[PDB]
Amino acid sequence: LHQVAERVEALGQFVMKTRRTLKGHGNKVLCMDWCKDKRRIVSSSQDGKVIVWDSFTTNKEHAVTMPCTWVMACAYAPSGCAIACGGLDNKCSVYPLTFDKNENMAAKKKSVAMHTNYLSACSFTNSDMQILTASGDGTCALWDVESGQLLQSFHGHGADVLCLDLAPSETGNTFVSGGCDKKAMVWDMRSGQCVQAFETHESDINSVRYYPSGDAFASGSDDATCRLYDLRADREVAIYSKESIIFGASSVDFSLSGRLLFAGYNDYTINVWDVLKGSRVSILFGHENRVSTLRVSPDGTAFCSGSWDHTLRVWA
Amino acid sequence: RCSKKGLGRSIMRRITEIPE
Amino acid sequence: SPNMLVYRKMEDVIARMQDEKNGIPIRTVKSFLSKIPSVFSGSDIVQWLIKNLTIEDPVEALHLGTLMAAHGYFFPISDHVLTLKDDGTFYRFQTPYFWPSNCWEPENTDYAVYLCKRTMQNKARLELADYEAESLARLQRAFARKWEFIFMQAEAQAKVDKKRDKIERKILDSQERAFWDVHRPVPGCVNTTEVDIKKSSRHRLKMSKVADSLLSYTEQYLEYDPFLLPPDPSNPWLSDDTTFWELEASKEPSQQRVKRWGFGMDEALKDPVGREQFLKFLESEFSSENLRFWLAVEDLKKRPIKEVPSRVQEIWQEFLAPGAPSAINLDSKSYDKTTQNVKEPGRYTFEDAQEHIYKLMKSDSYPRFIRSSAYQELLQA
């Protein structure tokens, strides 16, 4: 890959630094997601308080309290109708996002999914009606919105799965899995059959994302050794590591070009890497504590961080 | 008291020696 | 266990750090006030990092050093709060019995023991800071029964260590001071102990082919990347504008938009604008059905299980029932699959038929559309 990649002209200087700050939480922050409106903010905490900001404005337009602790995964509706927050209470509630009832954002709690263990993440599939979820069960499924009516199951695993992301393509609504077993496996939701798996890492794996052309996906874990994997060749493509960084790798997400690579780490920095030439390009020291999880806005204009410093920033 | 004290002393001594 | 490997790597680090032939030399300073041995200055460790690790940014190497020193692998001799500061201050490594890798866990009675011992070694001053005096006050108020043998073993230890030579008492008390800094730190700096509850337990093609595909998929939007090289310099984040997204709102596309449509009809259908203009051409060409079907399939794949049957039979009777106006066109196995599944509304009901019509449209419609006069006239301006 890079033996041919050296041909493409290398890339120049970056000057990205802060452009906002959020000061509302009262604990660590441990999940965040963009809307499709390309400007709002969703992020849940570990102390029972979910937030909905406007980083463009820093002005709260919602608020909500979850009954439990360690709210470890949130998600935003495509249109902006509902958000799914849950984990460690085994049940993933969903609230109607809109300005519908000025009484509460939690009062319309309607149980939709519920496993028997802590719940890792969730992502909407395509339509405001069907959400994924993952727990320590080692088994995921699709759960309808109003019903709680399970729709299919995947039991190919034996550990705690932690990863889940849609495909970009609207061709075959598939999705991806890799967990404590040191492996990654991808479900085909049309059946529920584990058609393809992957394993090279050295420990548990803490998130993954698709190459945004719908053709591959890389990742990083607490090995600190990020890797990128193809679907068509079925092979590792290039190692992503550096002896300097040693700590754990706690998120990844691509840039709309599909050029860069992002990853929040455990040594408190962030680390943008070239996807082809394999060099680092910056380390943008902002967070007094560890990086929780990280995302790119879908428009393609910036990215935020999840971190252990009790606040968020909007890194441009 | 004396027995407990002597035991504690010799034990802390043996511990600090095992640590050395 | 995950973090174990992390501590192992940093153990590799410090092991290379106090190397026999290379390494930092642990010096003995001489002062007008005293003669202190077995220390060194933070500039030394900074230099050592930069040499043997090739950490280009002084700041980056300093941050690595910062968190290492906040995991108890070296400390500043005169401070509670672990922070490596590049200057002339005196440091020290830690003892293999007091790393943090050894699963250690102090508890409240033992904090009381260390409090009584420190407060009773010297009796010249309250040799302590206000937070630790505060902690001892609480320990007093809550440990009403159990104090005595605490005091006992404390002064016992004091004798057992002072009996050894004067520099020995100093270095041992320094080490077994700092190792309780790290495991019960000052109010401000973050603890470096905790962990998250989660860890609280076949056709293939050549890589060169994938290389071309990946490079090309980069290039075709490479000039669209709003991080690397954006032609629209309007950045609502950076340059306090709103116009970029607002133009993104309007149905009139950008010439960027129209050039971007020309790559693949899939991206077109992703675009609502593209859907509208493609549908307009299909209508004016009297060819607005297959797109109508495929949109029908997709809009069906969105509703819950309450309407799946209500639509599947209806959509059959409208398109896939022979004798209806909208005449979707199937082959043998396609119409066989359709007839068998149509009894049972399914989340993947019309897969093969959708594949058939979809390859049809992708093979025929999109080409002539991009070749079409409307496309050219709209892309010109």
XYZ file of C-alpha atoms in Angstrom:
717
model
C 0.000 0.000 0.000
C 2.479 2.681 1.030
C 5.110 1.224 -1.319
C 2.839 2.664 -4.006
C 1.490 5.443 -1.764
C 4.794 7.331 -1.687
C 3.923 8.432 -5.230
C 1.097 10.776 -4.118
C 2.446 14.188 -3.181
C 2.957 14.615 0.556
C 0.882 17.049 2.569
C 1.603 20.382 4.189
C 1.168 22.341 7.384
C -1.962 22.377 9.542
C -2.933 25.150 11.923
C -5.963 23.627 13.591
C -6.706 24.692 17.140
C -9.636 25.511 19.393
C -12.688 27.355 18.177
C -15.170 26.762 21.009
C -15.607 25.339 24.519
C -18.504 23.778 26.449
C -18.867 24.351 30.186
C -22.025 22.544 31.299
C -21.186 19.103 32.632
C -20.352 18.303 36.257
C -18.435 15.043 35.765
C -16.439 13.255 33.097
C -18.019 13.131 29.657
C -18.306 9.829 27.890
C -20.228 9.996 24.591
C -20.974 12.471 21.836
C -22.612 12.618 18.435
C -23.429 15.079 15.698
C -26.811 15.631 14.113
C -27.369 15.715 10.432
C -28.057 19.435 10.722
C -24.302 19.754 11.016
C -24.310 22.233 13.895
C -25.872 20.821 17.078
C -24.312 18.678 19.789
C -25.205 15.577 21.747
C -23.150 14.159 24.600
C -24.033 12.188 27.712
C -22.205 12.008 31.003
C -21.460 9.444 33.685
C -23.528 11.196 36.360
C -27.044 10.960 34.884
C -27.418 14.161 32.867
C -27.598 14.182 29.057
C -27.061 17.496 27.294
C -27.993 19.096 23.989
C -25.899 22.173 23.221
C -25.350 24.445 20.272
C -21.582 24.839 19.951
C -22.228 27.460 17.301
C -24.024 29.349 20.081
C -23.125 27.660 23.407
C -26.760 28.022 24.447
C -28.613 25.108 26.006
C -31.908 24.261 24.324
C -32.534 20.980 26.140
C -31.629 19.115 29.302
C -32.397 15.660 30.633
C -31.564 13.334 33.512
C -31.101 9.637 33.233
C -32.161 7.465 36.202
C -28.876 5.570 36.288
C -25.130 6.023 36.233
C -22.377 5.489 33.682
C -24.446 6.488 30.687
C -22.009 5.020 28.217
C -23.592 5.620 24.811
C -25.785 8.221 23.148
C -27.106 8.635 19.612
C -28.879 11.327 17.588
C -31.837 10.933 15.280
C -31.328 11.577 11.577
C -34.104 14.118 11.392
C -33.637 15.083 15.011
C -36.469 13.254 16.777
C -34.872 11.016 19.398
C -31.716 9.955 21.259
C -30.812 6.587 22.777
C -28.823 6.596 25.999
C -28.003 3.568 28.073
C -25.535 1.126 29.519
C -25.077 -0.499 32.928
C -28.841 -0.476 33.376
C -29.305 -3.012 30.556
C -32.137 -0.974 29.014
C -31.749 1.617 26.258
C -34.359 4.350 26.597
C -35.172 6.768 23.775
C -36.629 10.246 24.154
C -38.439 12.373 21.566
C -35.900 15.113 20.896
C -38.276 17.853 19.839
C -39.653 20.810 21.779
C -42.824 18.791 22.294
C -43.320 18.653 26.082
C -41.745 21.531 28.012
C -41.985 19.423 31.183
C -39.092 17.004 30.677
C -36.865 15.343 28.115
C -36.843 12.153 30.206
C -40.520 11.940 31.208
C -41.459 10.292 27.894
C -39.021 7.466 28.648
C -40.266 4.527 26.611
C -38.191 1.377 27.021
C -37.386 0.083 23.573
C -34.459 -2.275 23.817
C -33.144 -3.950 26.920
C -30.378 -6.503 27.312
C -29.277 -8.120 30.531
C -25.999 -6.232 30.950
C -24.314 -2.874 30.391
C -24.900 -1.397 26.948
C -22.026 -0.197 24.733
C -23.432 1.973 21.879
C -26.175 2.567 19.338
C -26.518 4.233 15.988
C -29.943 4.527 14.291
C -29.461 2.290 11.153
C -31.053 4.643 8.595
C -34.504 5.598 9.857
C -35.611 7.031 13.268
C -37.317 3.724 13.882
C -34.638 1.054 14.394
C -31.606 1.269 16.674
C -28.703 -1.072 17.210
C -27.259 -1.907 20.649
C -24.400 -3.920 22.148
C -23.829 -5.207 25.672
C -21.474 -7.507 27.524
C -23.600 -10.400 26.245
C -21.504 -10.672 23.104
C -24.665 -10.407 20.990
C -26.379 -7.542 19.206
C -29.730 -7.024 17.563
C -32.113 -4.474 16.065
C -34.816 -3.110 18.354
C -37.841 -1.236 17.040
C -38.822 2.193 18.384
C -42.287 1.989 19.901
C -42.584 -1.760 20.312
C -39.556 -3.262 21.942
C -40.057 -5.951 19.339
C -36.707 -7.583 18.632
C -36.073 -8.110 14.933
C -33.032 -10.388 14.584
C -30.085 -11.623 16.610
C -26.332 -12.176 16.318
C -24.629 -14.629 18.657
C -21.272 -15.198 16.978
C -19.311 -13.839 19.927
C -18.105 -14.819 23.392
C -16.962 -11.632 25.140
C -17.865 -7.972 25.570
C -18.375 -6.311 22.206
C -17.771 -2.563 22.198
C -18.052 -1.396 18.598
C -20.865 -0.648 16.180
C -21.138 1.521 13.095
C -23.392 1.672 10.086
C -21.985 1.231 6.643
C -21.859 4.425 4.599
C -23.423 2.686 1.623
C -27.147 2.342 1.307
C -26.479 -0.886 -0.630
C -26.507 -3.641 2.004
C -27.343 -2.422 5.476
C -24.478 -4.209 7.186
C -22.432 -3.393 10.267
C -19.264 -4.226 12.111
C -18.238 -5.857 15.380
C -15.059 -6.402 17.326
C -14.583 -6.912 21.015
C -12.625 -8.373 23.953
C -11.944 -11.507 21.908
C -9.126 -9.638 20.103
C -11.095 -10.019 16.880
C -13.509 -8.130 14.686
C -16.516 -9.640 12.943
C -19.063 -8.099 10.604
C -22.738 -9.011 10.530
C -24.929 -8.981 7.461
C -28.232 -7.779 8.810
C -30.175 -9.424 5.980
C -29.494 -12.759 7.681
C -27.642 -12.459 10.940
C -24.744 -14.616 9.742
C -21.158 -13.763 10.639
C -19.867 -13.681 7.076
C -16.469 -12.186 7.837
C -14.177 -11.796 10.844
C -10.815 -10.190 11.612
C -8.221 -10.446 14.386
C -4.722 -9.058 14.819
C -4.894 -6.770 17.855
C -3.205 -7.367 21.174
C -5.955 -6.589 23.657
C -9.565 -5.506 23.846
C -10.720 -3.183 21.076
C -12.469 0.071 21.828
C -13.962 1.351 18.580
C -13.960 1.035 14.802
C -15.229 2.969 11.796
C -15.746 2.372 8.101
C -13.535 3.798 5.407
C -16.019 6.379 4.174
C -16.100 5.049 0.629
C -17.805 1.949 2.003
C -14.864 -0.320 1.192
C -12.780 -0.836 4.357
C -12.278 0.063 7.999
C -9.371 0.697 10.351
C -9.211 1.008 14.119
C -7.145 1.293 17.267
C -7.225 -0.240 20.745
C -5.325 -0.259 24.030
C -2.391 -1.801 22.216
C -1.834 1.740 20.938
C -1.285 0.010 17.592
C -3.956 1.173 15.151
C -4.540 -0.804 11.971
C -6.611 -0.521 8.795
C -8.349 -3.472 7.118
C -9.713 -4.072 3.625
C -12.878 -5.911 2.666
C -11.946 -6.912 -0.885
C -8.454 -8.305 -0.327
C -9.247 -9.486 3.215
C -5.925 -8.360 4.592
C -4.267 -5.885 6.896
C -3.175 -2.855 4.881
C -0.612 -1.034 7.014
C 0.394 -0.728 10.641
C -0.459 2.434 12.526
C 1.714 2.781 15.605
C 4.547 4.865 17.038
C 6.760 3.963 19.971
C 6.407 7.457 21.417
C 2.667 7.239 22.077
C 2.206 4.269 24.384
C -1.174 4.751 26.002
C -4.502 3.354 24.901
C -6.422 4.282 21.766
C -9.935 5.371 22.619
C -11.581 6.456 19.363
C -11.246 6.815 15.611
C -13.079 8.686 12.840
C -12.221 9.825 9.366
C -12.289 13.152 7.562
C -14.763 13.659 4.733
C -11.961 13.468 2.229
C -11.042 10.128 3.564
C -7.511 11.509 3.674
C -6.596 12.051 7.320
C -7.071 9.789 10.305
C -8.269 10.837 13.722
C -7.865 9.103 17.059
C -8.159 10.272 20.650
C -5.621 8.561 22.851
C -4.882 7.893 26.503
C -1.774 10.120 26.749
C -4.153 13.087 26.557
C -3.223 14.302 23.099
C -4.978 13.824 19.841
C -3.157 12.383 16.854
C -3.905 13.070 13.216
C -2.112 10.668 10.896
C -1.754 10.555 7.139
C -3.655 7.593 5.735
C -1.092 6.978 2.998
C 2.423 8.056 3.980
C 2.070 6.941 7.582
C 3.607 9.984 9.226
C 2.109 11.985 12.051
C 1.007 15.519 11.185
C 0.294 17.149 14.533
C -0.402 16.623 18.205
C -2.760 19.222 19.509
C -2.454 19.305 23.269
C -5.740 20.420 24.742
C -7.070 17.938 27.273
C -5.970 17.853 30.907
C -7.113 14.226 31.147
C -7.828 11.281 28.915
C -9.650 11.210 25.580
C -13.017 9.324 25.872
C -14.392 9.245 22.235
C -14.229 11.361 19.119
C -16.250 12.200 16.005
C -16.182 14.212 12.762
C -19.038 16.418 11.804
C -20.744 14.927 8.746
C -20.625 18.093 6.695
C -16.860 17.712 6.911
C -15.833 20.913 8.620
C -14.434 20.046 12.040
C -14.346 17.524 14.862
C -14.924 17.313 18.601
C -13.372 15.213 21.353
C -14.633 13.218 24.277
C -12.346 13.534 27.255
C -11.860 13.025 30.965
C -11.557 16.740 31.789
C -15.267 17.459 32.527
C -15.869 19.600 29.408
C -15.827 19.462 25.624
C -14.083 21.467 22.930
C -14.820 21.891 19.210
C -11.500 21.331 17.511
C -11.144 23.027 14.146
C 0.642 -6.158 75.428
C 4.297 -7.172 75.582
C 3.726 -10.251 73.431
C 1.751 -8.265 70.862
C 4.379 -5.530 70.817
C 7.282 -7.939 70.359
C 5.437 -9.808 67.632
C 4.544 -6.599 65.805
C 8.109 -5.330 66.049
C 9.750 -8.517 64.801
C 7.119 -8.813 62.083
C 7.591 -5.286 60.786
C 11.330 -5.917 60.914
C 11.023 -9.108 58.879
C 8.736 -7.287 56.452
C 11.103 -4.353 55.914
C 13.895 -6.880 55.428
C 11.852 -8.864 52.894
C 11.333 -5.530 51.147
C 15.079 -4.958 51.100
C -6.039 -6.903 31.881
C -5.450 -3.914 29.593
C -3.573 -1.274 31.551
C -1.138 -3.945 32.721
C 0.353 -3.884 29.223
C 0.564 -0.094 29.421
C 2.496 -0.202 32.669
C 4.666 -2.929 31.159
C 5.616 -0.709 28.235
C 6.499 2.175 30.532
C 8.479 -0.286 32.638
C 10.447 -1.015 29.479
C 10.876 2.749 29.341
C 12.332 3.296 32.801
C 14.410 0.118 32.529
C 16.108 1.622 29.509
C 16.119 4.806 31.574
C 18.400 3.660 34.429
C 20.624 1.689 32.044
C 24.124 0.783 33.190
C 26.194 2.053 30.244
C 23.731 4.716 29.124
C 21.172 6.498 31.258
C 20.836 9.589 33.381
C 23.527 9.846 36.064
C 22.113 10.155 39.577
C 24.340 12.888 40.961
C 25.231 14.180 44.417
C 24.790 17.925 44.656
C 26.836 20.111 46.965
C 25.336 23.327 48.273
C 26.281 26.214 50.512
C 23.491 24.941 52.786
C 23.982 21.170 52.455
C 25.341 18.289 50.354
C 22.514 16.331 48.724
C 23.385 13.102 46.869
C 21.521 10.849 44.418
C 19.353 13.332 42.522
C 19.256 15.012 39.126
C 17.605 17.863 37.273
C 14.518 17.741 35.091
C 16.478 19.175 32.185
C 18.497 15.964 32.353
C 15.432 13.771 31.840
C 14.149 16.096 29.139
C 17.447 15.720 27.293
C 17.333 11.943 27.817
C 13.865 11.727 26.278
C 14.845 13.877 23.309
C 17.965 11.833 22.690
C 16.768 8.264 22.974
C 13.165 8.777 21.821
C 13.501 11.412 19.055
C 10.467 13.326 20.294
C 10.558 16.307 17.959
C 8.434 18.685 19.981
C 10.016 19.621 23.294
C 6.418 20.100 24.395
C 5.433 16.609 23.235
C 8.326 14.927 24.991
C 7.530 17.059 28.018
C 3.946 15.813 28.069
C 5.066 12.195 27.845
C 7.408 12.906 30.729
C 4.577 14.639 32.543
C 2.232 11.709 32.658
C 5.042 9.245 33.307
C 6.046 11.273 36.334
C 2.418 11.370 37.355
C 2.370 7.554 37.386
C 5.075 7.270 40.052
C 8.291 6.633 38.165
C 9.922 9.827 39.415
C 8.929 12.791 41.591
C 10.137 16.253 42.632
C 11.965 16.036 45.922
C 10.314 19.079 47.488
C 6.736 18.827 46.210
C 3.585 16.812 46.751
C 1.979 17.168 43.296
C 3.804 15.115 40.678
C 4.707 17.337 37.702
C 7.884 17.285 35.627
C 9.120 20.855 35.179
C 12.107 21.353 32.888
C 14.508 23.163 35.192
C 17.059 22.713 37.941
C 15.058 20.707 40.477
C 15.936 17.350 41.960
C 14.174 14.091 41.136
C 14.427 10.388 41.871
C 13.269 7.027 40.559
C 11.014 4.764 42.583
C 11.456 1.365 44.195
C 10.440 -1.962 42.608
C 8.323 -2.686 45.667
C 6.597 0.662 45.170
C 5.842 0.880 41.525
C 2.175 1.238 40.679
C 2.198 -1.980 38.642
C 2.066 -4.056 41.822
C -1.723 -3.940 42.277
C -1.304 -1.914 45.445
C -4.238 -0.467 47.363
C -3.816 1.562 50.536
C -6.679 1.989 52.976
C -7.829 4.453 55.566
C -6.156 2.914 58.639
C -2.856 2.921 56.834
C -3.283 6.553 55.924
C -3.757 7.132 59.622
C -0.499 5.277 60.282
C 1.473 7.416 57.883
C -0.114 10.556 59.329
C 0.847 9.728 62.908
C 4.358 8.757 61.803
C 5.109 11.917 59.818
C 3.596 14.134 62.474
C 5.676 12.445 65.159
C 9.101 12.092 63.545
C 10.219 15.676 64.018
C 8.079 17.664 66.519
C 9.542 20.959 65.329
C 6.612 21.888 63.061
C 3.374 20.500 61.682
C 5.446 19.045 58.890
C 2.574 18.853 56.418
C 0.148 20.813 54.212
C -3.440 21.809 54.888
C -5.104 19.024 52.930
C -3.192 16.330 54.799
C -3.921 17.977 58.141
C -7.561 17.990 57.083
C -7.444 14.273 56.286
C -5.954 13.510 59.679
C -8.708 15.477 61.426
C -11.349 13.275 59.798
C -9.400 10.110 60.544
C -9.374 11.163 64.180
C -13.096 11.861 64.307
C -14.019 8.549 62.715
C -11.379 6.162 64.121
C -12.262 6.745 67.794
C -11.512 3.181 68.869
C -8.412 2.190 66.903
C -5.466 4.525 67.336
C -2.996 3.067 69.770
C -1.050 0.370 67.943
C -1.039 2.765 64.998
C 1.035 5.208 67.049
C 2.926 2.227 68.429
C 4.071 0.738 65.119
C 4.672 4.216 63.781
C 7.294 5.138 66.323
C 8.535 1.568 66.195
C 9.226 1.980 62.471
C 10.805 5.345 63.269
C 13.311 3.654 65.551
C 13.837 0.702 63.194
C 14.754 3.057 60.387
C 16.588 5.832 62.250
C 18.777 3.088 63.713
C 20.185 2.735 60.209
C 22.365 5.520 58.879
C 21.217 9.115 58.506
C 21.169 9.189 54.698
C 19.292 5.909 54.699
C 16.460 7.328 56.787
C 16.300 10.290 54.430
C 16.097 8.361 51.164
C 13.705 5.717 52.474
C 11.381 8.302 53.958
C 11.471 10.318 50.751
C 10.460 7.300 48.675
C 7.745 6.092 51.007
C 6.475 9.615 51.105
C 6.155 10.121 47.358
C 4.554 6.741 46.782
C 1.647 7.923 48.896
C 1.433 11.171 47.063
C 0.708 9.229 43.875
C -1.897 6.968 45.486
C -3.761 9.735 47.306
C -2.971 12.932 45.420
C -3.544 16.624 46.149
C -7.122 17.866 45.499
C -6.252 19.396 42.159
C -4.230 17.051 39.939
C -6.045 14.031 38.544
C -5.678 10.673 40.236
C -3.768 8.329 38.011
C -5.141 5.143 39.511
C -8.700 4.613 38.412
C -10.097 2.557 35.561
C -13.396 2.501 33.715
C -16.112 0.049 34.734
C -16.062 -1.476 31.246
C -12.692 -3.001 31.966
C -13.987 -3.709 35.493
C -14.631 -7.345 34.606
C -13.512 -15.622 -1.675
C -12.762 -13.330 -4.610
C -9.926 -10.916 -3.849
C -8.075 -8.247 -5.810
C -4.521 -7.000 -5.654
C -3.552 -4.376 -3.093
C -2.455 -2.134 -5.967
C -6.074 -2.305 -7.112
C -7.186 -1.210 -3.656
C -4.431 1.387 -3.737
C -5.801 2.897 -6.945
C -9.355 2.763 -5.621
C -8.398 4.443 -2.344
C -6.211 7.108 -3.913
C -8.861 7.844 -6.535
C -11.721 8.002 -4.056
C -9.513 10.413 -2.144
C -8.728 12.519 -5.183
C -12.258 12.846 -6.470
C -13.143 14.674 -3.227
C -9.545 15.616 -2.365
C -10.493 18.998 -3.726
C -13.512 18.882 -1.418
C -11.761 18.141 1.888
C -12.563 21.145 4.105
C -9.524 20.392 6.210
C -6.803 20.099 3.585
C -7.651 22.178 0.521
C -11.150 23.675 0.408
C -11.981 25.935 -2.528
C -14.884 27.554 -0.593
C -12.866 29.395 2.050
C -16.130 30.195 3.818
C -15.674 28.357 7.108
C -18.573 28.852 9.530
C -16.354 27.537 12.214
C -13.186 29.486 11.470
C -14.167 32.613 9.541
C -17.445 33.323 11.392
C -19.558 32.858 8.283
C -22.903 31.161 7.717
C -23.144 31.386 3.943
C -21.541 28.024 3.124
C -24.116 25.839 4.835
C -26.901 28.206 3.790
C -25.908 27.700 0.168
C -25.928 24.023 1.055
C -29.582 24.509 2.038
C -30.824 26.012 -1.236
C -32.013 23.675 -3.977
C -29.921 25.509 -6.578
C -26.700 23.491 -6.486
C -23.117 24.594 -6.560
C -21.088 23.879 -9.663
C -19.171 21.757 -7.207
C -22.505 20.057 -6.533
C -23.161 19.387 -10.202
C -19.655 18.109 -10.869
C -20.039 15.873 -7.828
C -23.300 14.395 -9.081
C -21.437 13.150 -12.158
C -19.514 10.487 -10.254
C -22.222 7.947 -9.407
C -25.987 7.823 -9.379
C -25.810 6.417 -5.863
C -24.423 9.741 -4.714
C -27.104 11.403 -6.812
C -29.904 9.582 -5.009
C -28.180 10.517 -1.776
C -28.634 14.097 -2.911
C -32.282 15.163 -2.644
C -31.534 17.742 -5.335
C -30.138 14.970 -7.489
C -33.231 12.870 -6.871
C -35.432 15.742 -7.989
C -33.552 16.540 -11.171
C -33.047 12.928 -12.174
C -36.751 12.330 -11.585
C -37.610 15.379 -13.688
C -35.622 14.032 -16.612
C -37.200 10.605 -16.205
C -40.657 12.177 -16.280
C -40.023 14.432 -19.282
C -38.536 11.380 -21.014
C -41.659 9.394 -20.035
C -39.321 7.122 -18.113
C -40.114 7.827 -14.459
C -41.001 4.352 -13.168
C -37.934 2.317 -12.155
C -36.654 5.168 -10.031
C -40.205 5.355 -8.686
C -39.996 1.670 -7.782
C -36.591 1.874 -6.117
C -37.714 4.893 -4.111
C -40.746 2.811 -3.202
C -38.557 -0.024 -1.928
C -36.431 2.345 0.124
C -39.392 4.237 1.575
C -40.813 0.850 2.514
C -37.626 -0.148 4.326
C -38.169 2.725 6.785
C -41.480 2.000 8.506
C -41.876 -0.322 11.511
C -43.333 -3.826 11.555
C -46.808 -2.283 11.879
C -47.021 -1.360 8.179
C -44.753 -3.916 6.439
C -47.683 -6.155 5.389
C -49.921 -3.170 4.609
C -47.354 -2.021 2.064
C -45.954 -5.290 0.682
C -49.281 -6.625 -0.581
C -50.225 -3.153 -1.814
C -46.881 -2.602 -3.539
C -47.243 -5.998 -5.173
C -50.719 -5.102 -6.432
C -49.398 -1.785 -7.749
C -46.085 -2.846 -9.343
C -45.331 -6.551 -8.864
C -48.855 -7.815 -9.503
C -49.184 -8.591 -13.233
C -52.004 -6.457 -14.596
C -51.190 -3.266 -12.680
C -50.087 -0.066 -14.457
C -46.640 0.224 -12.904
C -45.081 -2.834 -14.548
C -41.864 -3.864 -12.858
C -40.251 -6.536 -14.996
C -38.800 -9.759 -13.609
C -37.152 -12.918 -14.852
C -37.914 -16.478 -13.776
C -36.098 -16.720 -10.440
C -36.847 -13.073 -9.630
C -40.608 -13.386 -10.016
C -40.451 -16.786 -8.323
C -38.742 -15.262 -5.290
C -41.225 -12.398 -5.299
C -44.236 -14.706 -5.448
C -42.917 -16.914 -2.668
C -41.975 -14.088 -0.315
C -44.958 -11.808 -0.991
C -47.095 -13.916 1.341
C -44.763 -12.899 4.192
C -43.820 -9.223 4.534
C -40.123 -9.097 5.234
C -37.438 -6.581 6.013
C -35.470 -7.907 3.026
C -38.494 -8.650 0.871
C -37.519 -7.559 -2.626
C -33.736 -8.002 -2.567
C -33.183 -9.753 -5.897
C -35.751 -7.630 -7.738
C -34.136 -4.489 -6.344
C -30.740 -5.783 -7.466
C -32.113 -6.467 -10.948
C -33.761 -3.083 -11.442
C -30.886 -1.340 -9.674
C -28.223 -2.721 -11.975
C -30.600 -1.812 -14.802
C -30.782 1.824 -13.737
C -27.085 2.072 -12.843
C -26.196 0.601 -16.239
C -28.485 2.759 -18.334
C -30.102 5.820 -16.806
C -27.233 7.621 -15.035
C -25.003 7.468 -18.154
C -27.464 9.215 -20.434
C -28.377 11.618 -17.631
C -24.777 12.767 -17.243
C -24.613 12.868 -21.032
C -27.809 14.910 -21.086
C -28.232 18.513 -22.175
C -29.941 19.455 -18.915
C -26.927 18.172 -16.987
C -24.507 20.083 -19.190
C -26.503 23.313 -19.060
C -26.857 23.091 -15.296
C -23.168 22.332 -14.770
C -22.109 25.287 -16.925
C -23.751 27.664 -14.439
